[PDB]
Antibody
Framework: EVQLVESGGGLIQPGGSLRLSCAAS????????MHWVRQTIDKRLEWVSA???????YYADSVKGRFAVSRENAKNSLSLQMNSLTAGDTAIYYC?????????????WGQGILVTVSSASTKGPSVFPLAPSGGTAALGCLVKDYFPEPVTVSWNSGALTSGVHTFPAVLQSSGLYSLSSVVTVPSSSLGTQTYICNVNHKPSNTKVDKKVEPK | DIQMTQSPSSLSASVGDRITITCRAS??????VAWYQQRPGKVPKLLIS???ALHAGVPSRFSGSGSGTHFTLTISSLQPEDVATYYC?????????FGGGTKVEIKRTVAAPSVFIFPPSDEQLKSGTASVVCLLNNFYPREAKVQWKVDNALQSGNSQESVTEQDSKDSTYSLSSTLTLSKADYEKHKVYACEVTHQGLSSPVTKSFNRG
């Protein structure tokens, strides 16, 4: 069926350039208007741009003059040239198919790709234990000062899932992200059962496995 | 069609209840209103178009009505899989804009949080910083007051909170509050305390430690 697959995102400097690409399958690009829609940090949805099969292009006022959208019908692919970027362009960008016959009706959405615009360099996280101290005990890992998103956190390489809570990242005033991951366990398992949080930060090629010991 | 606004920003209801989301338009546009559903961590999906036309795979408990500038989305038997953010959008008009979204949550019985506090690790102290973490686990409703006290002094501007999405099993939330100080500042004080006020707590719960 309809699959839209975005590529070409990542982290870029303000004033910089990125090219998003979208490979479409399950339908012919020629028959549909294709759009770009983004979800910014406030989780608001925002229409960005559109292109018709003949190559006619349209832009939201917030990106007009800075972005360039194009398509190649024969390759069933679409692209978004993003230039003169600002931190406000930071968002998840979706390649989207509009319903044929209707303008702006977004019936098929891609998987979305993260674009971050900042002057901050990539940076791996420091990973610190949140050490447990009566039936139920809590323990965790603090994953601090990394950039950009995302990180993945697992416990015991995915073997431990129950009672795990991984918090959404928060942006610190330093402009770097931080989050914690915690798990609830029987306090009687402390000292005998091993707990390790596995942290992977692909953008910085940082991989940390931290053992969290009691006290 | 120039501006879409939704009400409310968030709403709660029990499984089986009926809810109504409202989308206000600043100007009319021949009732070309679409509704999208975005489940947590997932991609938006088109639910309804032409204000009232249900799309593929959406249950008949979903309905939309309204005209002119007043538009509404109704779920007649709220289910856990309906927990999501719903967006209205004007289409077949310009500019294409979305409402700010309405977050739908399942309402359950009140549940007090279990509270845990974590001192900074020795490893972090070596780096020159100290984070103190206060964890509120498995509570409902989401609203909670978390206040940091350091040697009985109310703390402001040096903590951040983060809240999980509603748990798919028990419909509860968990919350972290993280107090960040310099190493020197951390070693300057003794008693660190997270005080938690919540609907399920008759009196506030304070979790504390002494540095050392």
């Amino acid at each position: 069926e309809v699959q839209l697959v975005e590529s070409g995102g990542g982290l870029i400097q303000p004033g910089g350039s990125l090219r998003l690409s979208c490979a479409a399958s399950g339908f012919a690009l020629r028959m549909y208007d294709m759009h770009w829609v983004r979800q910014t940090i406030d989780k608001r949805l925002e229409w960005v741009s559109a292109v018709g099969p003949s190559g006619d292009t349209y832009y939201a006022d917030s990106v007009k003059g800075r972005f360039a959208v194009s398509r190649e019908n024969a390759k069933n692919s679409l692209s978004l040239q993003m230039n003169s970027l600002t931190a406000g362009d930071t968002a998840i960008y979706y390649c989207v198919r509009s319903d044929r016959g209707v303008a702006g009706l977004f019936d098929s959405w891609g998987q979305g790709i993260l674009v971050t615009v900042s002057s901050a360099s990539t940076k791996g996280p420091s990973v610190f234990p949140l050490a447990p101290s009566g039936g139920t005990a809590a323990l965790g890992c603090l994953v601090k000062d990394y950039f950009p998103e995302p990180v993945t956190v697992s416990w015991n390489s995915g073997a431990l899932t129950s009672g795990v809570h991984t918090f959404p990242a928060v942006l610190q005033s330093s402009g770097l992200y931080s989050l914690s991951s915690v798990v609830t366990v029987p306090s009687s398992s402390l000292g005998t059962q091993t707990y390790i949080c596995n942290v992977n930060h692909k953008p910085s090629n940082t991989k940390v496995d931290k053992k969290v010991e009691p006290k | 069609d120039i501006q879409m606004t939704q009400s409310p920003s968030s709403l709660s209801a029990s499984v089986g209840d009926r809810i109504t989301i409202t989308c206000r338009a600043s100007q009319a546009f021949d009732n070309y209103v679409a509704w999208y559903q975005q489940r947590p961590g997932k991609v938006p999906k088109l639910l309804i178009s032409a204000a009232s036309a249900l799309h593929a795979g959406v249950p008949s408990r979903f309905s939309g009505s309204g005209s002119g500038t007043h538009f509404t989305l109704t779920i007649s038997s709220l289910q856990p899989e309906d927990v999501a953010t719903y967006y209205c959008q004007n289409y077949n008009s310009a500019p294409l804009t979305f409402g700010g979204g309405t977050k739908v949550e399942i309402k359950r019985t009140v549940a007090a949080p279990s509270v845990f506090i974590f001192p900074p690790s020795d490893e972090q102290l070596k780096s020159g910083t100290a984070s103190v973490v206060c964890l509120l686990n498995n509570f409902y409703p989401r609203e909670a007051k978390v206040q940091w006290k350091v040697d009985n002094a109310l703390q402001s501007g040096n903590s951040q909170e983060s809240v999980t999405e509603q748990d798919s099993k028990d419909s509860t939330y968990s919350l972290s509050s993280t107090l960040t100080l310099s190493k020197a500042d951390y070693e300057k004080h003794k008693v660190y305390a997270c005080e938690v006020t919540h609907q399920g707590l008759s009196s506030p719960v304070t979790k504390s430690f002494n540095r050392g």
